[PDB]
Amino acid sequence: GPLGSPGPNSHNSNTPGIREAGSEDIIVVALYDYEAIHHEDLSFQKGDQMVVLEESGEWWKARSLATRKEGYIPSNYVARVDSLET
């Protein structure tokens, strides 16, 4: 008896978990690489997008949207996806 792959008695397909909206999910990107100079901060890399969660000062709470890490981050290091030149 020759070899072969799996093969169930039925088949189906649909789109995957593709996202929506943006109005209340501040996607920023890191302008530069950062490595928590002082306590309670995220360490991110240049071109890490992050979902900002609080924005009330020069430092913002965010989550690395590539890796689901969280922390405060420097707003000078960073920039809204909606505000890029690309």
Partner: peptide, 12 residues
């Protein structure tokens, strides 16, 4: 927060 007067930006 405003814990520090921002980090020192890179060499660019």
């Amino acid at each position: 927060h405003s814990k520090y007067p921002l980090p020192p930006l890179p060499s660019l």
